[PDB]
Amino acid sequence: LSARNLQMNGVLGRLASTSQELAHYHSGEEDGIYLAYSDFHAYLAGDSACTKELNQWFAKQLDTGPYRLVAEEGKSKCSWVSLDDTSNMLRDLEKSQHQRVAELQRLRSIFGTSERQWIEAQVENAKQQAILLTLKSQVTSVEAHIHFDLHSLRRKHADLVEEISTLYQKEEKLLSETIPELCWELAQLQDTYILQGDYDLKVMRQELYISKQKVFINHLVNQLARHQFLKLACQLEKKNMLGAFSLLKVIESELQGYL
Amino acid sequence: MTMDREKERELELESAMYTNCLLLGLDPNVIGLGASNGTPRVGLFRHSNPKLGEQLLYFILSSLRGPAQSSKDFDKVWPIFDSAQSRDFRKVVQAIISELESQGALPRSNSRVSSLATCCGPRFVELLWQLSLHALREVHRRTFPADVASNPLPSSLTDVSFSHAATLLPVTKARIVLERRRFLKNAETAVQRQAMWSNLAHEMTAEFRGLCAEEAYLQQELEKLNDLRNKVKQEGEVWDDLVSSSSQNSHLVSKATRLWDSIMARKGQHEVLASGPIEDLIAHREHRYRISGSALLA
Amino acid sequence: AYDQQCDEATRIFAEYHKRLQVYVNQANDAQRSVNSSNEVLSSLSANSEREAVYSTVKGTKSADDVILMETTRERNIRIVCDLLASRMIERIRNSFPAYEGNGICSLPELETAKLGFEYDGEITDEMKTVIVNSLRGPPLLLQAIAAYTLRIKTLISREMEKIDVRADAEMLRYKFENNRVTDNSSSDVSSPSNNQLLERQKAHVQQFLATEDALNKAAEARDLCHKFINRLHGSADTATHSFVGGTTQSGSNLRQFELDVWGKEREAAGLRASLNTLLSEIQRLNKLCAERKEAEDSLKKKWKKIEEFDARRSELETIYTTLLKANMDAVAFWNQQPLAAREYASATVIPASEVVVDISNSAKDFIEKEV
Amino acid sequence: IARAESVMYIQRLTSEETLFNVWHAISELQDHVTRQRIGLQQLKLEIKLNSLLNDQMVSLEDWATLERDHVSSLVGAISDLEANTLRLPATGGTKADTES
Amino acid sequence: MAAKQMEEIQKKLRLLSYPRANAPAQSLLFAGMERYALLEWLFFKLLGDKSPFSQQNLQGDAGVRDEETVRIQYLAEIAKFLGITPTVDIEAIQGHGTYEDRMEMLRNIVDLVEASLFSDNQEWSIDEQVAKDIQLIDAIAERQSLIFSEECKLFPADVQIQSIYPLPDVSELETKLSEQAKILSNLQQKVDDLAAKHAYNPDEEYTEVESQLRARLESFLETARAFNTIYTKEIRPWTHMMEVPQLHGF
Amino acid sequence: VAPPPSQEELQSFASSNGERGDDLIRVLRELSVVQRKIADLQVELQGRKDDKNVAHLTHVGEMQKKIETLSRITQILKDVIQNKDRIIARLQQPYSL
């Protein structure tokens, strides 16, 4: 069993101080933790550049966005006196073309003929002949009811209907003197809402960004958040390297018991 | 100037008073009155009176001097013929001229008594002068008395009453009113005489403010101040009257005006009315501010 | 008695490196990277961090997961941004309007905290591999990712362009659609039937009810005037049947009482061309008169809708401020100088000479086993 | 009264010849007393302008191409100078039939 | 001058001076209240044998009551030939007309109401009856050929306006050449025979404006440098807006 | 000298017309010169004619009309050609009325 010592000492005794030259190097480790940090610090030329570009992909829109998407906001209310040239000039050929509307073709035609025949309504009810039953049956009208005499000039005729005599006219004020108003009210009585969607179309057109507004800038703040989560890594460099710096003394306590 | 204006108007009135009144007006007066101071007549009556007057005064009656030369010239010609013996023959003049005022100029003498008044006494100087000139012109003045006895033989004594107009030839000192009124009806002769025609100083004779003096020079260089325009009026007044020249004037002015008179004079009358299209081009931009922004701004 | 411990103590003395950096995870990995093959590379023990500097490729494969993780972090947003928006519906509406003072300079310290914890709550497979960088640090997982910070922030950019054009989407509206609407309903198809028009159904359901005669609609004045004559047009028809009405004709006073005895039959429901013909618009003329004066706002709809868009579009301008002024998104040493100040002095250089005796004793302890 | 008609007649005829020769010889007076101003008005302008109104067209270079082109400008330049001239008369009048 | 005086004084005779100057000869019928009253020296300077009848017509004119028809023509018994126009002086229509001769010896009675100036008994107030004015003398009347017909330029220019005034000396005009009297009016047309500079602006501006415009229209208004024949090429493209009303309203 | 014969101006008629009768031929000689007063002033219009209508009048009447011949054959033509960028763009609005 004594031969174990002769076998081990010939190979074990080779590590020497270069194995533990962590103390011999230790100056290089104190700034080395910064040297790896310095390589990250040396990447500031790109680190300060990659943060700007990612801030600039959404900010690529400055002219197309900010300088344009509040331009017509500037030409939204303060231009209500002047929008016709500030931003309507691009929209000029449609605003007036859509204001006239194509409904005019089916509106005006020859009227002298219609004024004679076609201006009149047409009947769809056949209640006029309701009397033609009692009209022919005079026996129950003059010989049976016999509610009449020489004094029945108006008292009998008022028995069936008297109150309706005053509640008769309801659809007046269009029979005469309404003629001159055929100038403008053509598209305001039945076609009142002739073009109530021209600017409502803009409202949706202003809103046509929802395919990506669900992201919009949610990614940006999270992209700022997420890319932070990656590169914050010196957090543990400030306690364990220090153990290789400050706690590294503890190896002298090993020899304290022997000494 | 204006003496060029008097070339032919002086041959019918200027020669109407002097040629006749030279011998009855004052010549007998001055001759008879010359006896007191007769020194100039000594050196003149020899030749100036009878001979020197032949060039001017004796040619007036030369038309009738042929047939009736010796009418009254005999009283002067005959004494002259005896010039070689004129020393011993000098007392016959006053007698040979007495008949001149007694037969030739006897009616004339009656009119000439006023001119004879200062020389009726001194007839010696007067009849001597009468020999030289008065008798010679009386030959002209004796034509009327002499011709009566010859030409109007059937009407000799009958015409003596009608000869009152013809009697003026001897009695020749009351006809001055003829030429006196003449130069009013024909004051169109000159101004230097009793007439007037060479008158004024602003538009007739001394119109030298540019009119008369220049008019003399309007034949050499002062007429060139304006008339040269016509040559440079080749585009103009020279080729005005000839329209064919005017037609080729436009053809030949095809560096200055032919286009204006032939390429666009044919359209210049209906051309100016297109200034309206200038306004129409810049009139449709007014409604780019009000319509859609004020469709219901009111 | 105590002499027996000295014999076994020489081995633990000569193995300082096997313990002096194993708690030092930023240096344990690099030391065990080199000390594993042989104990000669135990020199790279405090040089382990220097080896950790030399471990860029080891950091690269350490960052290789981060390369794909952030890329998946980029794409986990893409596949499901609803969960992203779930914590950030307010961002598309009030990131600038409300979160103004939060993202000025501490955005990648609090906007991370407000999101990341609830980010893991909703997008669970991103925040489990974010702090893992800290354990490796600039040795492995802060310098290697620095060499690839552009890739993660440019591959994310490709997926940004399809959300960056949100302004381009309104940019389409603000001038392009302003240029686009010239003659779409005039030139694309004559007498248009294009689906691009949708706000016309109000007339479609009602105005098609009468489109043939002109004066009945061109002259709305005489229309009801002569539509009501249909009620007054029956006088001629009534007199036509006078030869049938002679049943009661027997005397002068035999009809006056009959004016209602015969009138009680003719009078019935026959009123549909006077009031029902205008019943579909007059009902709107008894409650919608004031809107005619208020119709200015209806025309001002485009003149006013962009006002709330300013809140979105000034937010569009100023999210850039929330981003550009957040220059410290990728400058991860902004707060590491306060971290660095912790180890300016605590990076002690006493061990460079003092525990050298200990390693020298450790060096002398490699051969004492022969006794 | 002896001369009577011969008071005027002989002076009358002799006045006529002077009334011919020098009256019209002096008549050239007004040709350069009221026209000498024309000499400083019309003569000078033609020297100053009639050649210069040729020279004025050194600016009107292409206009000067029309005066010589009168042989063919009655169709060529006219189709330029009258086509725009016809812009006016056929615009207002021919549109009046719309109200009919 | 004196042409008006043929009428200002003559209308006096016919009506006013009929008892004074028209017919003093007929006024011997009125001598009982006209001769001895006023027309004694008027008769004394007008009539013949009745002229010296100063104080004897008050009782010796009984034979004149049957004479008025021939008593009037006795107006110029001194000028028997002139005494013919007083015969028609009975007729005011022609009696007033015939005064180119009758007036002449009635000068002594219309203006010379005191006719007795020792001379106008026989002569017609012409020779020295007019000696009150030296210019009235007949001898100096003809001196207008020396003094009056010569002022500076004015009076000859004051009569040239009309072409019909040449009455006195026109005989040597009317024979063969009166065209100069026809251009008599043209001096009225052209009075400023020297200056006449009114044509400075009109005629010169027909030419002067051409050169000035060359110096005025500096190629901006006068864009006609080399384009005048160039316009011929491209009239149609702008003329298309002619034919749009014609492509539809033809 | 008309007033001084306050009494016998009526018989001065012989001194009235002849007062210029002697000066008559004065005038007519100088107004035979005025036969040229037609030429210097009256015949100006004959001279000025064809001195202007084919020399100067149309070299006036057809010159200052280049303020409009140019402004009609160029101003309509040249301006819309040299400013076509705004000519077409401006007509975007009016054509839809």
Q: Answer whether D touches C (≥3 Cβ pairs < 8 Å).
A: no
Contact E45, E115 (CB under 8 A): yes
Question: Is A248 in the C-facing interface, judged by CB distances under 8 Å?
Answer: yes
Best residue of F92, F95, F97 to probe chain A, by most A CBs closer than 10 Å: F92
Flag if B226 and D67 touch (Cβ within 8 Å).
Answer: no
> Residue A56 is encoded by which pair of tokens?
């600039």
* Amino acid at site B33: L
Same domain? F40 vs F73? no
Nearest one of B18, E17, E156, B172 to D2, comparing CA atoms: B172
Residue F1 lies in a domain: no
DSSP character string of chain F: --SS-TTTSTTTTHHHHHHHHTTHHHHHHHHHHTHHHIIIIITHHHHHTTTSTTTTSHHHHTTTTHHHHHHHHTHHHHHHHHTHHHHHHHTTTGGG-
Q: Is A38 helix (H, G, I), strand (E, B) or coil?
A: helix
CB C44 within 8 A of CB C51: yes
CA distances (Å), origin E112, targets B88, E1, E9, E80, E116: 71, 20, 12, 22, 8
| Chain F partners (3+ C-beta pairs within 8 A) | A, B, D, E
Residues sharing a CB contact under 8 Å with residue A116, sequence separation 6 or more, in sequence order: none
Nearest chain F residue (CA) to E239: F77
Query: Would you call A21 helix, strand, or coil by DSSP?
Result: coil
Cβ-Cβ contacts under 8 Å, F59 against chain D: 53
Hey, are the CB atoms on C296 and B296 less than 8 Å from each other? yes
How many whole angstroms separate alpha carbon E238 and alpha carbon E232? 12
Breaks in chain C (C to N > 2.5 A) come right after none
Dig out the tokens for E224 from the structure.
């006609």
- Please indicate, yes or no, if residue F5 is contained in any of the structural domains: no
Q: In the block, which residue shows the tokens 């006794």?
A: C371
Q: Which of A18, A250, A31 is nearest to C349 (CA)?
A: A31
Q: Which residues from chain C sit within 8 angstroms of residue A92, using beta carbons?
A: 182
CB contact under 8 A, E238 and F76: yes
D81 touches chain F (CB under 8 A): yes
Cβ–Cβ under 8 Å, residues A200 and C199: yes
Please list, in sequence order, all residues whose beta carbon lies within 8 angstroms of the beta carbon of residue C152, skipping any fewer than 6 positions away: A227, A230, C66, C67, C70, C71, C74, C145
Crossing angle (nearest 10°) for helices C56-79 and C149-164: 10
* F49, F78: one domain: no
**What is the count of residue pairs from B and F with beta carbons less than 8 Å apart?**
125
Q: Which residue of F has its CA nearest to B243?
A: F50
Q: Which residues contact B247 (CB under 8 A, 6 or more apart)?
A: none
- In the three-class reduction of DSSP (H, G, I as helix; E, B as strand; rest coil), residue C3 is classed as helix
CA atoms within 13 A on the CB side of F97: 9
Residues with Cβ within 8 Å of residue D71, at least 6 apart in sequence: none
Non-local (6+) Cβ contacts of D90 within 8 A are E242
> One-letter amino acid identity for B6?
E
User: How far B284 CA sits from the closest chain A CA (Å)?
Assistant: 14
Q: How far apart are CA D9 and CA A15, in angstroms?
A: 177
F36 part of contact set with chain B, CB < 8 Å: no
Residue E39 sits at the vertex; the CA angle it makes with E38 and E44, to the nearest 5 degrees, is 135
Cβ contacts of C57 within 8 Å, gap of 6 or more: none
**Pick from A82, A92, A96: which is nearest to B293 by CB?**
A82
Taking Cα atoms as reference points, which of B55, B79, B73 lies closest to residue B135?
B73
Give D77's DSSP letter. H
Distance CA D81, CA F72 (A): 10
Q: Which residues of B166-185 are buried (b: 16+ CB within 10 A; e: fewer)?
A: ebbbbbbbebeebbeebbbb
Determine the Cα angle at A114 with ends A110 and A115, to 5°. 110
From the centroid of its chain, how far is CA E156? 14
Q: What size, in residues, is chain A?
A: 259
Residue pair D24/F32 in contact by the 8 Å Cβ criterion: yes
Instruction: Suggest the residue from A50, A67, A107, A239 to mutate for an interface test with chain C (most C CBs closer than 10 A).
Output: A50
- Cβ contact, residue pair C170, A65, below 8 Å: yes
Q: Is the dihedral of CA C226, C228, C232, C234 positive or negative?
A: positive
Tokens of E163: 């072409």
* Interchain pair F72, B257: CB under 8 A: no
**In the structure, do chain E and chain B come into contact, i.e. share 3 or more CB pairs under 8 Å?**
yes
Q: Do D70 and B259 touch (CB under 8 A)?
A: yes
Neighbouring C-alpha atoms within 13 Å toward the C-beta of C356: 10
Return the C-alpha torsion angle A8, A14, A15, A21, nearest 10. 150
The whole-angstrom separation of Cα A238 and Cα C343 is 6
Inter-residue contact B24 to B107 (CB < 8 Å)? no
Which of E176, E199, E225 is the closest to D61 by Cβ? E225
Give the Cα separation of C299 and B291 in Å (integer): 12
Closest-CA residue to F14 (of D40, E148, A166): E148
Q: Are D29 and B215 in contact (CB under 8 A)?
A: yes
A93 touching chain F per CB within 8 A: yes
Closest CA in chain D for residue F31: D27
Sign of CA dihedral B93, B94, B96, B97: positive
| SS3 track for A133-161 | HHHHCCHHHHHHCCCCCCCCCCCCHHHHC
What tokens does D46 get?
Answer: 């033609």
CA nearest neighbour of A220 among A48, A59, A47: A59
Q: Is residue A157 within 8 Å of residue C256, measured between CB atoms? A: yes
Contacts of B286 (CB under 8 A, 6+ apart): none
Give the residue from chain F lying closest to B245, CA to CA. F50
* Touching status, chains B and C (3+ beta-carbon pairs under 8 Å): yes
Burial (CB count within 10 angstroms: exposed 0-12, middle 13-18, buried 19+), residue D53: buried
Residue F40 lies in a domain: yes
E81: nearest Cα among E65, E64, E105: E105
Residues in contact with B207: Cβ distance below 8 Å, sequence separation at least 6, in sequence order: B200, B201, D29, F30
Rounded to the nearest angstrom, the gap between the alpha carbon of residue D74 and the centroid of all alpha carbons in its chain is 25
Question: Using the beta-carbon criterion (under 8 Å), do F96 and A89 form an inter-chain contact?
Answer: no
Say how far apart CA C31 and CA A29 lie, in whole Å.
Answer: 12
Question: What does the block give as tokens for A64?
Answer: 């197309």
Instruction: Name the residue with tokens 């002697």.
Output: F22
Q: Compute the distance between CA of residue E229 and CA of residue D60 in angstroms, rounded to an integer.
A: 11
Q: At what angle do helices A218-231 and A44-58 cross, to 10 degrees?
A: 170
Chains linked to D by 3 or more Cβ pairs within 8 Å: B, E, F
Identify all chain D residues contacting F41, using CB atoms and an 8 Å cutoff.
Answer: 34
CB atoms within 10 A of CB A26: 27
Within a 13 Å sphere around the CA of D91, how many CA atoms are in the beta-carbon half?
14
Taking the C-alpha atoms of residue C295 and residue B298, their distance in angstroms, rounded to an integer, is 11
- Write the CA distances from B2 to B181, B203, E194, integer angstroms: 25, 11, 18
Dist CA B266 CA E234 (whole Å)? 21
Phi, psi (rounded to 5 degrees) for E51: -60, -50
Range of the domain at F45: 12-63
B13 contacts B186 by C-beta, under 8 angstroms: yes
Instruction: Measure D2 CA to nearest chain E CA, in Å.
Output: 19
For A78, the token pair is 């303060």
Asked if residues B215 and D30 have their Cβ atoms less than 8 Å apart, the reply is no
Please tell me the distance in Å from D30's CA to the nearest CA on chain F: 5
Residue C292 sits at the vertex; the CA angle it makes with C289 and C294, to the nearest 5 degrees, is 110
Select the residue from D8, D62, D88 to test the E interface by mutation, using most E Cβ atoms within 10 A: D62
Residues 10-69 of A with CB under 8 A from C: 12-37, 39-41, 43-44, 46-62, 64-66, 68-69
Residue C238's nearest CA partner among D44, B267, A127 is A127
Q: Read off φ and ψ for residue B23, nearest 5 degrees.
A: -120, -15
**What is the spatial distance between Cα C72 and Cα C129, in angstroms, rounded to a whole number?**
11
CA–CA distance, E136 with B84 (Å, rounded to integer) = 62
Residues in chain B: 298
Give the CA distances from residue F17 to residues B23, D68, E43, F22, in Å, rounded to whole numbers and listed in that order.
36, 64, 32, 9
From the number of C-beta atoms within 10 Å of its C-beta (0-12, 13-18, 19+), residue E249 rates as exposed
Q: Note whether F29 contacts B: Cβ–Cβ < 8 A.
A: yes
Out of D2, D67, D89, name the one closest to residue B165 (CB). D2
Query: Widest CA span of chain E, in angstroms?
Result: 121
State in Å, rounded, how far the first CA of chain C is from the last one: 18
Is residue C59 a contact partner of residue C141, using CB atoms and an 8 Å limit?
yes
Handedness of CA A225, A227, A229, A235 (dihedral sign): negative
What whole-number distance in Å separates Cα of residue A59 and Cα of residue B285?
38
Q: Which two tokens mark B142? A: 């004796």
Per-residue HEC secondary structure of chain B comes to CCCCCCCCCCCCCHHHCHHHHCCCCCHHHHHHHCCCCCHHHHCCCCCCCCCHHHCCCCCCCCCCCCCCCCCCCHHHHHHHHCHHHCCCCCCCHHHHCCCHHHHHCHHHHHHCHHHHCCCCCCHHHHHHHHHHHHHHHHHHHCHHHHHHCCCCCCCCCCHHHHCCCHHHCCCCCCCHHHHHHHHHHCCCCCCCCCCCCCCCCCCCCCCCCCCHHHHHHCCCCCCHHHHCHHHHCCCCHHHCCCHHHHHHHHHHCCCCCHHHHHCCCCCHHHCHHHHHHHHHHCCCCCCCCCCCCCCCCC
Query: Of F49, F52, F53, F54, which to mutate for an interface test with B (greatest number of B Cβ within 10 Å)?
Result: F54
F88 reaches B (C-beta below 8 A): no
Per-residue H/E/C for E198-231? HHHHHHHHHHHHHHHHHHHCCCCCCCCCCCCCHH
Question: How much is the CA Rg of chain F, to the nearest whole Å?
Answer: 34
Whole-angstrom CA distances from A75 to A68, A81, A82, C310, F93 are: 10, 10, 8, 11, 18
Q: What is the C-alpha separation between D44 and D25, in angstroms, rounded?
A: 26
| Nearest partner of B19 among B182, B179, B195, B181, judged by Cα | B179
Domain ranges within chain B, ordered by starting residue: 25-172, 240-281
> What's the CA gap between C278 and B118, in Å, rounded?
149
CA distance B89 to chain D (A): 43
**Full DSSP string of C11-67:** HHHTTSHHHHTTS-HHHHHHHHHHHTT-GGGGGTTTHHHHHHHHTHHHHHHHHHHHH
Contact E51, E121 (CB under 8 A): yes
Both tokens assigned to B239: 């080729």
User: Are the C-beta atoms of E101 and E95 separated by less than 8 Å?
Assistant: no
B-contacting chains (≥3 CB pairs under 8 Å): A, C, D, E, F
